[PDB]
């Protein structure tokens, strides 16, 4: 139960000691944990719904890109790579609190899982019209669909104003990033990525019309509302049944 | 928001000194989120919990206030004031215990009170069910305590103390945590606000007879209080869905 929360908590700490994860990242991880408590630390129906749309969107994309930050590098290095391949997307390292050493360390971390994998962002020349804020001209710069997980709200908003269709993974359904993205997956990235990889496989042979069917029916606003409603119902349920001295929830 | 950054730095600095555990930085972030969820203030259920905690401490025969790396960075002065106001002993008790951390914590406290007695330097007693360094307490502190305050604590340790028959009070912004659920009295408020309020409550209740104190404790239901905290959060989530930008 709490085993994994402790497991990933140590992974996050390891990432900082290795030079990949920022201190702000440890703070961020903690905030995510609070919200993971609200949704019961699992994938809820509204999240699976959002992931179906996300995968469909990527499979329909012309220049898809998956972004990687210090937290992603520490939590799902292999899965982020598998997702990129499953979605035929490019991987770009893009840090909010960027330093070249963090970028190099992250790239090295990813290489350990796939020495031949192509990694963008090591030398970003273009800049998102929003000091920092540089992106690879062959990656996010040209991308039509971008996946930017555990992202700072402002950054998420910038990319959108930039004409990009933004997909994010964020446990905080009330965050600016969650509200601003086009498709918001409110689930722990450690759970969301392996589910998306599997969804991608299952949808591999879908025609364009059935992929468009899934995307067209998706409403991000309605989905975020369902997330909050799920949380409110669960809270009401817990309050009414009581949680004092309760072993597990 | 200004004070949010202020306390974040205190924690980060505490981490760089080797006083606050690294996990404490993560725990601080979890606290920030829940503080946001309840309103960044002392809600009525928290005040209700504090009144009962204070009354219970004034009834205690061997009260002890536990101190960890996060307390040391956030409320070093207020925890000493609280121990005095409640006539309780102070004991450093860490989950990620190391002698260097204990010494560093003790030193921080000494900056505010050079003569303050500090237990937990040489713990010789084991908490049943708790292994190694994470499970030893001071023979004259928590080991003999009837009422103990273990703020921002890991649930397993809170529970182990309860299993021992001790009356456990905790300050924890996460009402859903195992610690919050297992404690006898759970204060869901930020510790930077809770301690100064408990200091004030203690002075206001110092002349209370044991009957008045027992009245307060007797009317306190931690289960209903935890439920109210959850309903409060639920209601805030709702309003919050209107307050602030959207899309
Ligand atoms: C995370 C961080 C520090 C990484 O910086 P860098 O590595 O420099 O790019 C940076 O992107 C940042 O400042 O993010 P924020 O803290 O603004 O927002 C991160 C969002 O991710 C959420 N979150 C944290 N961990 C997870 C998680 N494990 N899974 C899903 N969501 C998560 C967190 O609640 C918050 O809503
Ligand atoms: C905090 C920590 C790492 C300290 O370790 P050590 O110093 O080694 O004893 C250890 O006790 C721990 O792991 O605690 P947990 O993370 O299990 O639980 C701490 C609780 O405190 C909560 N919290 C964080 N900051 C505050 C705070 N500022 N005020 C009230 N509650 C807070 C946090 O949300 C969490 O529910």
UniProtKB/Swiss-Prot annotation, chain B:
So where does ATP get bound?
A: 8, 30, 172-174, 178-179, 190-191
Q: Does the keyword Zinc-finger apply?
A: no
How activity varies with pH is as follows:
Optimum pH is 6.5.
User: Which superkingdom does the taxonomy of this entry point to?
Assistant: Archaea
Instruction: Give the record's GO biological process terms.
Output: coenzyme A biosynthetic process
What is catalyzed by this enzyme?
A: (R)-4-phosphopantoate + beta-alanine + ATP = (R)-4'-phosphopantothenate + AMP + diphosphate + H(+)
The temperature profile of activity is: Activity increases with temperature elevation from 65 degrees Celsius to 95 degrees Celsius.
> Which keywords, in A-to-Z order, does the entry hold?
ATP-binding, Coenzyme A biosynthesis, Ligase, Nucleotide-binding
Q: Which residues form a coiled coil?
A: none
- Give the top-level enzyme category: ligase
Enzyme nomenclature, EC number: 6.3.2.36
Pathway per the UniProt entry: Cofactor biosynthesis; coenzyme A biosynthesis
Null mutant: what phenotype?
A: Only viable in the presence of CoA or 4'-phosphopantothenate.
The GO terms this record gives for MF are: acid-amino acid ligase activity; ATP binding
Q: Which PANTHER family match?
A: 4-PHOSPHOPANTOATE--BETA-ALANINE LIGASE
Q: Which HAMAP family match?
A: PPS (MF_02224)
- Family note: Belongs to the archaeal phosphopantothenate synthetase family.
Q: How does it assemble?
A: Homodimer.
Q: What does the UniProt function comment say about this protein?
A: Catalyzes the condensation of (R)-4-phosphopantoate and beta-alanine to 4'-phosphopantothenate in the CoA biosynthesis pathway. Cannot use (R)-pantoate as substrate and thus does not display pantothenate synthetase (PS) activity. Displays strict specificity for its natural substrates, 4-phosphopantoate, ATP and beta-alanine.
Protein name as it appears in the record: 4-phosphopantoate--beta-alanine ligase
Q: State the species of origin.
A: Thermococcus kodakarensis (strain ATCC BAA-918 / JCM 12380 / KOD1) (Pyrococcus kodakaraensis (strain KOD1))
